[PDB]
Every structure is written in structure tokens, then in C-alpha cells.
Structure 1
Amino acid sequence: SLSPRVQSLKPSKVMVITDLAATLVQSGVPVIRLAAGEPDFDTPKVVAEAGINAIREGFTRYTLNAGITELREAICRKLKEENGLSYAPDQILVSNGAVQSLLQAVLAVCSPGDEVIIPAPYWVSYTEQARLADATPVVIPTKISNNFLLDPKDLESKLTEKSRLLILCSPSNPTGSVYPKSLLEEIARIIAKHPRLLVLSDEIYEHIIYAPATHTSFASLPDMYERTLTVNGFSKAFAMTGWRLGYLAGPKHIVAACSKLQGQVSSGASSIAQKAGVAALGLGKAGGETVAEMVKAYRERRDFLVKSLGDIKGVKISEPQGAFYLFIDFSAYYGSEAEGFGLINDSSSLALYFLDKFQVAMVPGDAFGDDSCIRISYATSLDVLQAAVEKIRKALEPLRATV
């Protein structure tokens, strides 16, 4: 009655839980919302004003399929100034959010049966998008003791003649890990020996990064420009969640194919959002002081959460180097019997315990391929995080941690 690919598709637990918490709040049940990673900043003033001006001036008509020229040119300038990458404007495809940019890249390059190599913990949609292409996800687990970074030995062990695409998210959602240049250079030398292997570099969290970590675009590495699909966007750095503006930069032939696909599925961004994007890039390098305030706020929220929760017996934390998520290992608590709730034995039941009994919404690690952890978004206020920490502490107090 439904197609196999849509029938077998897993729902996004980020969307399910975020929507559920929003619905609970509306019903009159307060919930601390730490699920979807949503900046609590407004869209910056000059960006919002560019969107308003676009409406006031009637910029509501047809726009070039791949994105307005002024936006693609500004994106090329950003990729050179910030990332050291040289793209022509027809190597940029602007879409309705970076998730659409990612999907079109996967659909364009993966043939049925190709393997898509996905390090876990992975962002929730990577495996499902591979399946939508009729491709095979090949998941490579990573370890909290190695800061959830891909071990190149494990990559070597999973390569086959069918390997087609490696997805690298850095800074990572959900772990907040940042790939150091030296490790990226080692991975690139592996990629270079396999002529069919492409890399999807998901860089949307680029500017949400905590020194001394630094961001290295994969396409800047030796021999990698011609095999890298660079995905970036506006939602996270510029608090543009609801505007929907992302982009792909890559080899001309692949971008041309993604653009042809976009023209037949009408996946473009709104004319209003595109004008707002031009203004966001006009804030200068890395978003200037506007984005710097955000990064400073996220860092102080990170520090508060890591200190507060790292003190709890049994908890294991990889201190994140970017993004605004903690991927916290509460697995020592699995097996606990919570009076009034029941057995807590996996990430789903632990997350449900926090939600149903303490009204704190988080996303279980199984959604990201690692049942040992729970993802907490900290793109919310310090007052809210303080309230959440008190509840998490009280929730774990009557339980027990294995040693």
C-alpha cells in the first residue's frame, strides 16, 4: 500500500520528540525543550531587515533555479575568505535548507547498491537518505574515549569496491567533535587511493566552534577538491532556523546534476530568504561580532552543562569542540529500576523517563546509531539549563551506576 522505501524509512526521532514537546507545552504541560538544536537568538537585525525589505520591495517573483546571482557570488567569496576554497558561481546550488542540499548530493552520486560510509554517532538523517537512493549505509562506530572520531583503521577495514560516499560532519551533530587537520589529512590520503570515493563534508556548524579547535574544510586538503561535496548553510550560525537556506558547493558536473534534479522537484529557497542570506554574508568574516556573541554564549552554556553533569556518578562526557550538543553517556545507569516508571535499560527508555517523569525533552542516542548516550541541545538560556540540571540530578539520584 506504500512504497517499500517510504514504508521502511525510519522517522526522525529529533522531529518526533521536538514536535511532541511542543505539543505538550501547548496542552498546558511545561517542558524543558533540549531536543532539536535551535538557536535562542533572534535572526540578526540586518538580516531580518533584508528579509522585510525584500517583501516591501516586491521581491516575491521567480528567481533563478540555482539561487540569485548575488547570493551565489557572495557564497563564493565566503568559501574563499573563510575556507580557502575557489568555486565559480555555477558550482553553487542554493536550496531550501542544508538537509535538502545533502539529499540531492546523495541522490546525484549514489547508484543502487553503492555503499555510503557513515561514522556513528551520525546525524539522524544520514542513513535514511542513503536508503532513499537505494544505497547501502555502512556505519562505522566510534568511541567516546577517542572523542567520537573516526579511526582510519576502521575506515580501511570497511572499504569495498562498492564504497562511493563518505559523510563527514564537522563540527559534528550529535557529538560536538571537531576533526583535526592531521586526522583529515590521513583520511584524505585514503580517499585519494580509491577513484570512485567521494566525500560529503557537512560544515553547517562551522562557526559554532570553541578555540583552540579550528575548522578545516575537507575540500581544502590535497587532491580532495575534485571529490568533495561541501554542504553549508545559514540556520545555525545566523539563527535562521525558520528561513530555510542552505547550499552545496562542488565539482561542476555534480552541481549541474543536482541543479537539474532541483529544477524538476522545485527544492529552491524562497526569494525572501535569499536576500536575507546576502545580508548575513555581509556581516563579514565568520559573521563578525554578531556571530561572535553567539559562539561566546554557546561556549559558556557548554561549560556550565559539562561541569554540572560531569560531576554525577557514572556519567561520561566528551567535551565538545563545536556545535551546541552534548552527547552524554548515562549507560552506567542502564538496569536501574525507577520507582513509578520501571526499568531503564536503553537510551529510549532513559529519554522517556526524563520526559514523562521530569518534563525534560532530549533525544535518545539510538536515533544517532549509539544507544549508550543521550543528546542534549544547549542552545537555550542559562536559566533553563540550570533548571534542567536540577531535574536531571534529581532523576538520577534514586538510581544506581555500575562501576
Structure 2
Amino acid sequence: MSLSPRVQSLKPSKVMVITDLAATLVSGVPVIRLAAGEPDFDTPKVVAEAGINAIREGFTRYTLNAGITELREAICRKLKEENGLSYAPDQILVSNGAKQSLLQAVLAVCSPGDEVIIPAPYWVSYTEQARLADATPVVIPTKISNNFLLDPKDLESKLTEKSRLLILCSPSNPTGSVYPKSLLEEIARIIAKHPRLLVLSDEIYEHIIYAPATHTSFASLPDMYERTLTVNGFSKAFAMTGWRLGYLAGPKHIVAACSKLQGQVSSGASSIAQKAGVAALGLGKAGGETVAEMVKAYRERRDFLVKSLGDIKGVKISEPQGAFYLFIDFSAYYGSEAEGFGLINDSSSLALYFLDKFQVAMVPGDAFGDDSCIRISYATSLDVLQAAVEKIRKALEPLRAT
């Protein structure tokens, strides 16, 4: 009955657990679902059509494991036009989603004992992927008064000789924060003084961004091109959740080793999805009006929640600059009791209270390494969001702040 130590010490993704729990409950139990971050739009018409055309034209046989040339060349043009980055097509590795991209990158560059520096709140997979490579997660807490942005001084103090990989998610999952160029530059100068330290730049939410914030690719900073693994994809910006199409861009020697690894553990992205990705990149800079319409809806949802929830006593919010998540501080309510439920002690019991007693499904902050908050996804309709706020207010009424 035994299992490997790597897998048995692995922690289930609470994002997926709660999501599937809410789905299954939706039996015949109506639950407001704000856990997993999945765009509530159809794949854009021309993208879907390219996928259909791929099938109809029999584009279902062997394709290059690393990705078809047509897609990798289109990805190089995107990186240059949108991010100012110069890559050759063999510096691109196309995978089945960004989760696989990140894993292969970590396995490729992290030796046993190496330290992976992960700012909190973090996306749930960063720590677990680190452990899978026999690497040691080095978590750096951030503060809500600082938009959950990394403080350079904290970075420096935690650097050792074993420091190998720094993970930079911008715009962030779960906080929605966007690293300004100013801060990236300071981090860069720190990185530059540590020959062994590489940077993983997770830019999947790049186009989900709200003015005046701007996205700055870390590979674009002075001396950082040689240090940076750029991870990006299609699912969030183009509503291609079921397609699964991610990619990695980076230094030749690293990308070549990830491609070798992928060749032994994966078949690569589907040929059908890759054709769809080509058409998605064909929509123009930043996905054009297609993606702009979607961003405009996200922005309207953001503003509704931020004003609605921020008014509430003992609720603290950082107005997000991108993505589609709110990382809300309800910690003031910890220590109080809700009749019929019990004590609200932390983010997990609070979320469980929201779910059991008010049928709203959110994800507790402890899954992202910050127990002071709970994450809401607002890739859902405005009416759902209105109903969710009404329930959150009612839920917090019998509780006590601080």
C-alpha cells in the first residue's frame, strides 16, 4: 500500500479541490462559484474556427514535439512586438499548458538542495513543483499595504549560495498585483550580483491588465535576458481553458534541456490547439479588440467588487492592477463565533463558513501561503458577483471585527 515520499508529501491543489467540490454540489445545490480562475467567455470565433479547420483538414498526425514551426515563429514575433524580446524559434518550447512549462523549467535548472525563492501570496503550484525537483521552497511574505509586492531588502536577506531560482508572477495570481519597472530594476541589480541565480517570469495574465498599470517582461531588463525563463500562454487571455497551450522562452541551453525532457515525458500540445494558437496570435497586438472587450468586462467586475467589498467593516482590499482575482483580507473577523457553524479561526474555516452556510465558494489564502486573506475570482457575471456580495455581507453580520 506504500507510495513514494515525493507524492505522499505533496499537497492537493485547494483551488481544484474547492472548484470540483462546488461543481459536484451543483447534485441540486446552487453555489456561487468564485474559486478557480476560468474566463467566462467562448473561445473567439476565428480561433475556434482555426481549430475546426485543423480537424477538417486532417491536421491530426505527427507534429514536432517542441511545437510546430508556424506557432513557434508566431510566438517569436509576439515576444518582439509586445515584449521587446528577441528569440529564435528554437528558443521556444510549446507545451500543454503553463503548468507543464513551469515544471519542466524547474526540473531543468534546479539541482537537489537548490533554493527556489517564491514571494507570497503565491500561485499554489510553485512550492509543490519546487519540492518535486528536490529543491527547497524559500517563501518571502509580502504585505497588503505594499500591494503584495516583493521588498528588495527581504529578497537580499534571504539569498544564499544555494539560491537558484526566483519566481516572478506578474500580473499576479492570486493578488492581481503588477510589478512596476522601477521595482523589477532593483530586483534585477540584486540578481546580477549572484551568478547562479535564474528568474522564472510568469506572464500568463499579461493582457489582463488595467490602466495605468503596464506589463514589463523581466527578460527585457539590463543583463537579465540570459537569466530569465519567460512563461506565457493562451488560456487566460483568449479564453482557451480547454485547449491547453502554454510556452517557455529562454536561453538556448536551458530551452534545449527542457525540450529534451519534454520529449521523454510528454507528447507536447495537441496539433489542433497549436493551429488555434496561431490564429489567436493572428488577432494582432495584445489580441486586438477581441481581448480588449474581455478586459473591459473584467475591469467592470473588478470595480464593482472593490467598491462593494471595501466599504464593509474589517475588510481590507488591495485594488488589483491585473488578472481577475481579489485577495481579500477578512482577518479582522478571525476569533469570532458563528452560531450553527462554530469558530472562525483562519482563512480555511472562514471559507468553509461561506461555503456551508451561504453557498459561496472561494479559496482560503493559506493555499497561497497567506492565511490572512481569501481569494475571489471575478471571471463570472456581474449578477453572480452582486449576489455574492449580498451573501458575504449577510455572512459577516453576526461576526465580530478584531
TM-score, L = length of structure 1: 0.99
Aligned residues of 1:176 and 1:320 also touching (Cα < 8 A): yes
SS of the counterpart of 1:18?
helix
Aligned residues of 1:203 and 1:217 also touching (Cα < 8 A): yes
Q: How far apart, CA to CA, are the structure 2 residues paired with 1:214 and 1:265? A: 36
Matching residue of 2:93: 93
Question: Which digits, 9 at most, give the CA deviation of each residue in 1:227-259, with x for residues without a partner?
Answer: 100000000000001110000000000000000
Give the C-alpha shift of residue 323 in structure 1: 0.3
Give the C-alpha shift of residue 157 in structure 1: 0.3
Aligned residues of 1:121 and 1:369 also touching (Cα < 8 A): yes
Q: How far apart, CA to CA, are the structure 1 residues paired with 2:66 and 2:32? A: 39
Give the C-alpha shift of residue 267 in structure 1: 4.7
Question: Which digits, 9 at most, give the CA deviation of each residue in 1:35-72, with x for residues without a partner?
Answer: 00010011000000000111111111111010000000
Which structure 2 residues correspond to residues 27-42 of structure 1 after superposition, within 5 A? 27-42=27-42
Q: How far apart, CA to CA, are the structure 1 residues paired with 2:48 and 2:154? A: 45
Q: How far apart, CA to CA, are the structure 1 residues paired with 2:34 and 2:180? A: 28
SS of the counterpart of 1:261?
helix
SS of the counterpart of 2:242?
helix
Which aligned runs of 4 or more in structure 1 are off by greater than 6 angstroms? Answer: none
Give the C-alpha shift of residue 398 in structure 1: 1.1
Question: Which digits, 9 at most, give the CA deviation of each residue in 1:258-306, with x for residues without a partner?
Answer: 0000000115100100000000000000000000001110000000000
Q: Percent identity?
A: 100
TM-score, L = length of structure 2: 0.99
Q: How far apart, CA to CA, are the structure 2 residues paired with 1:72 and 1:113? A: 34
Q: How far apart, CA to CA, are the structure 1 residues paired with 2:250 and 2:241? A: 24
Q: 1:165 to 1:264 in 2, by over 3 A?
A: same
Question: Which digits, 9 at most, give the CA deviation of each residue in 1:154-182, with x for residues without a partner?
Answer: 00000000000000000000000000000
Q: How far apart, CA to CA, are the structure 2 residues paired with 1:270 and 1:205? A: 22
Q: How far apart, CA to CA, are the structure 2 residues paired with 1:288 and 1:267? A: 31
Q: 1:267 to 1:335 in 2, by over 3 A?
A: farther
Give the C-alpha shift of residue 336 in structure 1: 1.2
Q: How far apart, CA to CA, are the structure 2 residues paired with 1:283 and 1:358? A: 42
Q: How far apart, CA to CA, are the structure 2 residues paired with 1:113 and 1:267? A: 29
Give the C-alpha shift of residue 381 in structure 1: 0.3
Question: Which digits, 9 at most, give the CA deviation of each residue in 1:193-223, with x for residues without a partner?
Answer: 1000000000000000000000000000000
SS of the counterpart of 1:241?
coil
Give the C-alpha shift of residue 350 in structure 1: 0.3
Q: How far apart, CA to CA, are the structure 1 residues paired with 2:113 and 2:62? A: 38
Q: How far apart, CA to CA, are the structure 2 residues paired with 1:253 and 1:301? A: 43
Q: How far apart, CA to CA, are the structure 2 residues paired with 1:8 and 1:360? A: 30
Which structure 2 residues correspond to residues 123-162 of structure 1 after superposition, within 5 A? 123-162=123-162
Q: How far apart, CA to CA, are the structure 1 residues paired with 2:366 and 2:279? A: 38
SS of the counterpart of 2:337?
strand
SS of the counterpart of 2:64?
coil
SS of the counterpart of 2:232?
strand
SS of the counterpart of 1:243?
coil
Aligned residues of 1:208 and 1:237 also touching (Cα < 8 A): yes
Q: How far apart, CA to CA, are the structure 2 residues paired with 1:241 and 1:361? A: 20
SS of the counterpart of 1:11?
coil
Which structure 2 residues correspond to residues 304-319 of structure 1 after superposition, within 5 A? 304-319=304-319
Q: How many residues align?
A: 401
Aligned residues of 1:100 and 1:267 also touching (Cα < 8 A): no
Question: Which digits, 9 at most, give the CA deviation of each residue in 1:51-110, with x for residues without a partner?
Answer: 011111111111101000000000000000000000000000000001100000000000
Matching residue of 1:245: 245
Q: How far apart, CA to CA, are the structure 1 residues paired with 2:395 and 2:52? A: 45
